[PDB]
Every structure is written in C-alpha cells, then in structure tokens.
Amino acid sequence: KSEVAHRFKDLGEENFKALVLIAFAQYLQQCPFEDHVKLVNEVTEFAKTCVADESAENCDKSLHTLFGDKLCTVMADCCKQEPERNECFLQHKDDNPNLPRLVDVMCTAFHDNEETFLKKYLYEIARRHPYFYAPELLFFAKRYKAAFTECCQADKAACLLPKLDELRDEGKASSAKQRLKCASLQKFGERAFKAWAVARLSQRFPKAEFAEVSKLVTDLTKVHTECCHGDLLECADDRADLAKYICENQDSISSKLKECCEKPLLEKSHCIAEVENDEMDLPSLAADFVESKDVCKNYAEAKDVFLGMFLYEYARRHPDYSVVLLLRLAKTYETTLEKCCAAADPHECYAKVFDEFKPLVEEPQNLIKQNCELFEQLGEYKFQNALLVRYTKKVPQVSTPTLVEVSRNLGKVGSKCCKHPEAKRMPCAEDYLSVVLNQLCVLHEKTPVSDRVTKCCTESLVNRRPCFSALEVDETYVPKEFNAETFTFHADICTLSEKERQIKKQTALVELVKHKPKATKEQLKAVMDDFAAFVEKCCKADDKETCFEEGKKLVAASQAA
C-alpha cells in the first residue's frame, strides 16, 4: 500500500523532491517558481507520514490523485476525475512556451544559496522542456553544482564557461533525443519504440543473445513510458533497477561496461547510456531470413518475434548503419514478406529482398557524403545558411523562428558527425537528423500551418527523413510581402555577440526566401552578403542608429535580385 512511500524509500528524499519539482514544472509551466517549491514541501511532508506508516489517511491514494489534487489547489478545465484529469494535464504540455530568459557575478547567487540556485535551474529547464528526461536532469543538476564547486572561487570566467558550454550543449541534445522517444511512444505506439530499442541495443551489445536484448528492451520501454506519461518517480526507480540489473549480468550482455558500474548511481546509468558499442564470424543472414523455404510459415507463426529476430540479427552486425536505416530495412523486409508470401511462388519472390535493400542503404550514404562535402566547402555558418534556404523552400509556411532553430541544429549535426570515421558517421548524422526533424514536427504540431509538414511528420516514423528529403520547393506557396514585424533592424544588433548577430542575419534570410521561394540560384548569395555588409557598415558608423536610411535602400537593391 501507499506508492508514495514506496518511491520515497527507494529513491531517498533528495531525489524525491527534485523529481516532484520537475513534475509540477512540466505540468504547469506558467506558474512562478516559489509557488512550486511550496507544493513540493507539502507533498514531501505528506510522504514522510506514509514512510512512517503506510496505512495513514490518504497514503493508499494514487500518485496521480496526490499530484493532481494539489496541482489544482492553486487549465482549471482539467481539474474532471482521475482516469481523465491526468490526461488533460498531459495534452496541455507546451513544447514552445511563451518564456524568454534562457555573468560570472551571477556566481554570487550560487554562493548566497547553493540549494535554491540549483532547484531554480531545475525549474527553468523543466518548464521550457516539458519532456526532459527527469532522471537525466538530476544528472545535469549534479554536474551543474559540480562545475560551480570548482571555478567560482583566480580567473572564474575561465574555468566555469568551458564547462558551462559543454553541459548546456549536452542539455539541448538530451531534451531533443528524449522528445523523440516520447513522440514515438505517444504518436506512433509502443511497437515503434520497442523496435527502435531492439536495434539500438543489438548494435550496442551484439554479443548478448536475443533473450537478454529482448529482456532489456521490455524494461527500457516501461522506463520511458512512465517518464513521458509524467510518472517520474516510478521512472527514476525503474531506471535504477535496470542500471543495476546490468553489471550483475555483464558478461551475458557485453564486456565493456565494467568501468561504468563502479561509478555512483546517477553517473553509472548515464555511463551505460553513453557506452560505445561492444566488439562486433556469424552465419549468413540470408540463410534464415531470405533463402530458407520456411520464411513465410515462421513469419506467420510468430510475426513480431520473427521481425524482432531479424532486426536483432541485422543490427548486431551493422553498427555502421544508422538505427533509422535498420528500422527502414526491417519495414521493407516486413512489407516484402507480406506481399510475396501471399503470391504464387513466394521463395523466388522474397529471395530478391537483399537487392531492394541495396538502394535503401546507398541513399543515406550518398546523402551524408554530399552534405558533408557541402559542409567542408562552406563551414558551419554558411552551411547553416545553405540549409536555411533549403528548408524554407520545402516548407515556407513554417514559422521563421522554427525554421531558424531547425536549420541551425542541422548545421550542428554536420559539424559534429562529418569529422567522424565512416564506420560511425552515418549513425551520427542520420539518427541526429531524425532527432532534429522530430523537433520541427513537434514545434509545427503546436500550430500546424503546412500540410506538407503534417504529412511527412505523420506518414511513418522510419520514412520521416526520406519524406522531407523528397521535398524541394512548395509550388503552392504565395510569396510573403515585407512588413514592419518582418524587416526592421536598428543599431541594437551591434551590441550583440557574434552568435546572436548571426542568428539575426539568419532570421532575415528566412524572410528573404519567404519573399520569393523560387529566386534561389546564388541570387540569394548576393542578397545575403548585401545584408551582411549593411550590418557591418552601420555598426561601425558615426551616427545615431540613423544608418540602419540604408534599410529601405539596399532592400530595394535586393528586390532588384
């Protein structure tokens, strides 16, 4: 009885009220910080009475009832009964909240109140990332404190920032990768997430057999179902159970995790999550899945088991393949079996399934090869502008900030993965590609404006990237005329850093392409540099922001091109 006392004893108090603070902030993202900490205090106070005795007044209540009840003491449409009032809080999670505020003298605030500083960090991140992996957010919290426990007491802004530039970089990656996990579980189903897990684990532990891989998949599926559904306490508990289930059966999984298990709890599960693939002779995979005469009857007797074995055996031999490609081949193998098993001569039909896999393998290899060549031709900034143009052409109805954020992240994928050896570059490039594309989909789903985005985002998870790749120019889009909210500049841009000055210039490039999505050539190259020189000139000028006159001036010169 009393699930709150179960999780309080299993997780401890410190991790308890931190996870409870992440949950309320991800549900009600617009409430002030000091209102949540008081709710956490009253919830943590009630939990200790249930730890004192599991059968008090309301201990036996669900965690949905306990959390939902006091979520509503201070959206009021939802606060209906529990089998429904909890779902109402879920579909109101805002992936793009109207929040704006995301300095070595702030390091003072750390030393004035180390605790409130760290918990306000959890509050600000969780409310802007309502699907953040909460057990992993505790890890960034410890790493946040850890960094401040080293460089905040000679040259502060020299030890802090190189670590406060790697953590936040991992933070954006962590929230985006987890957002894809939640989308696959909630939009595409448990079967889709388990298929992704089977391929991911088979690549990672190719020495582990189909039993333990299937075992770890089932546990991993329950972990992320709870977290994405808002069951943060059970999710952190089960994540600790699974991380400790490994290590105890390490040699039956992979001989490469030993230096991760002597590590503390939050860093050991983060270690196992960031472990690289184990070491990869096996029989020909065509024998059991292609050339055997019993392929159709084995497939019909146990469909998902047969498909899982195929994905496990294929992924265990191809760590050079992306996970999304392996899922793509498994989908093709399923579709081919469905068609040829029902045909006249099935054996001669599905015996060609490896020939149709050939273009599906070469397509991402060619795409990454060409775009990494384009990256090395332009550098990251110009590669971002090239992708900016490319994607505003595909889907010009998408909001300009969304197109700028997606295209800039696509450029970051090139800077990171194109330097890798080809034996690990496609897993990097293509799987991060699906992560960034999922960002576009969830941001567009909040305010759908383009049926082309909607179709590619809802067609199929594995065909998402090929769907977007096939787009070129939206031939039905009517050009947008320039307005006041679109094109005005002033001299406040010169006080900006080098990064947000480029983002401003990249914001205007999107509006350029929206003004005429057919222009392209490198006619857009001339305009983008006409705007660049326009900013450099008026920033170094001798005036009172009266230069930024030249606005109506060179804009017309770009209507000439």
Q: Which residues have C-beta within 8 Å of that of residue 259, sequence separation ≥ 6?
A: 271
Instruction: Judge whether 72 and 39 are in contact, CB under 8 Å.
Output: no
Residue 193 CA: distances (Å) to CA of 86, 183, 269, 457 = 23, 9, 20, 16
- DSSP states along 474-536: -TTPPPPPP-TTTS---GGGTTS-HHHHHHHHHHHHHHHHHH-TT--TTHHHHHHHHHHHHHH
Q: Which DSSP helix (H) or strand (E) runs through 428?
A: helix 422-446
Residue 9's region, left for phi above 0, alpha for psi from -120 to 50, else beta, is alpha
User: CA 416 from chain center: how many Å?
Assistant: 16
The Cα–Cα gap between 257 and 277 comes to: 10
Packing angle, helices 550-559 and 523-539, rounded to 10: 170
**One CATH from 1.10.246.10, 3.40.190.10, 2.60.40.10, 3.40.50.1820 for 285-368:** 1.10.246.10
Q: What share of the chain is helix, strand, coil (3-state, %, to 5)?
A: 70, 0, 30
Please calculate the CA angle 117-123-126 and round it to the nearest 5 degrees. 135
The Cα–Cα gap between 291 and 305 comes to: 19
Whether 285-368 and 183-274 are alike in CATH topology: the answer is yes
The residue numbers preceding gaps of C to N over 2.5 A in the chain are 74, 79, 102, 153, 280, 548
- The reply to whether 304 sits in an annotated binding site is no
The single-letter code of the amino acid at 123 is Y
- DSSP states along 123-148: HHHHHH-TT--HHHHHHHHHHHHHHH
The Cα–Cα gap between 25 and 35 comes to: 10
How many residues appear in the chain? 561
Q: Which DSSP helix (H) or strand (E) runs through 326?
A: helix 323-340
- Among candidates 430, 519, 508, which has minimal Cα distance to 473? 519
Instruction: Judge whether 451 and 467 are in contact, CB under 8 Å.
Output: no
| Number of neighbouring beta carbons within 10 Å of residue 86 | 22
CATH class of 183-274: mainly alpha
- Among candidates 530, 474, 509, which has minimal Cα distance to 385? 509
- Give me Rg for the CA atoms of the chain: 26
User: CA 237 from chain center: how many Å?
Assistant: 22
The residue whose two tokens read 């985005």 is 453
Instruction: Judge whether 216 and 201 are in contact, CB under 8 Å.
Output: yes
The Cα–Cα gap between 18 and 44 comes to: 10
- Among candidates 141, 138, 143, which has minimal Cα distance to 163? 143
**DSSP 8-state assignment for residue 60:** T
Q: Which residues have C-beta within 8 Å of that of residue 15, sequence separation ≥ 6?
A: 138, 236
- The reply to whether 10 sits in an annotated binding site is yes
The Cα–Cα gap between 41 and 153 comes to: 31
- The reply to whether 420 sits in an annotated binding site is no
- 528-531, long-range: CB within 8 Å, 24+ apart, which pairs? 528/385, 530/554, 530/557, 530/558, 531/505, 531/558
555: which 2 tokens? Answer: 């804009």
Task: Render the burial of 225-251: b for 16+ CB within 10 Å, e for the rest.
Answer: bbbbbbbbbbbbbbbbebbeebeeebe
Task: Render the burial of 531-541: b for 16+ CB within 10 Å, e for the rest.
Answer: beebbeebbee
**DSSP 8-state assignment for residue 256:** T
545: which 2 tokens? Answer: 């922001």
Q: Tell me if residue 32 falls in helix, strand or coil.
A: coil
**How were these coordinates obtained?**
X-ray
Instruction: Judge whether 232 and 90 are in contact, CB under 8 Å.
Output: no
The Cα–Cα gap between 234 and 241 comes to: 10
| Number of neighbouring beta carbons within 10 Å of residue 413 | 21
- Among candidates 75, 85, 59, which has minimal Cα distance to 1? 59
Q: Which DSSP helix (H) or strand (E) runs through 429?
A: helix 422-446
The Cα–Cα gap between 207 and 203 comes to: 9
The Cα–Cα gap between 3 and 63 comes to: 7
Q: Tell me if residue 231 falls in helix, strand or coil.
A: coil
Residue 455 CA: distances (Å) to CA of 61, 465, 511 = 42, 12, 24
The Cα–Cα gap between 41 and 46 comes to: 9
The Cα–Cα gap between 189 and 225 comes to: 10
- The reply to whether 226 sits in an annotated binding site is yes
85: which 2 tokens? Answer: 């009032």
Instruction: State this model's resolution in angstroms.
Output: 2.0
Q: Which residues have C-beta within 8 Å of that of residue 154, sequence separation ≥ 6?
A: none
The Cα–Cα gap between 133 and 122 comes to: 12
- Among candidates 42, 167, 32, 97, which has minimal Cα distance to 443? 97
Instruction: Judge whether 406 and 439 are in contact, CB under 8 Å.
Output: yes
The Cα–Cα gap between 435 and 180 comes to: 6
The Cα–Cα gap between 174 and 217 comes to: 20
| Number of neighbouring beta carbons within 10 Å of residue 550 | 17
Instruction: Judge whether 277 and 201 are in contact, CB under 8 Å.
Output: no
The residue whose two tokens read 């909460």 is 134
Burial class for 105, CB neighbours closer than 10 Å (0-12, 13-18, 19+): exposed
Q: Tell me if residue 459 falls in helix, strand or coil.
A: coil
Taking the CA atoms of 273, 274, 275 and 276 in sequence, report the sign of the dihedral they define.
positive
- DSSP states along 262-300: SS-HHHHHHHHHTPPP-------HHIIIII-TTHHHHHH
Q: Which residues have C-beta within 8 Å of that of residue 375, sequence separation ≥ 6?
A: 383, 411, 414, 415, 418
The Cα–Cα gap between 120 and 33 comes to: 7
The Cα–Cα gap between 113 and 34 comes to: 14
Q: Which DSSP helix (H) or strand (E) runs through 405?
A: helix 400-417
First to last CA, the chain: 72
Instruction: Judge whether 17 and 44 are in contact, CB under 8 Å.
Output: yes
**DSSP 8-state assignment for residue 160:** S
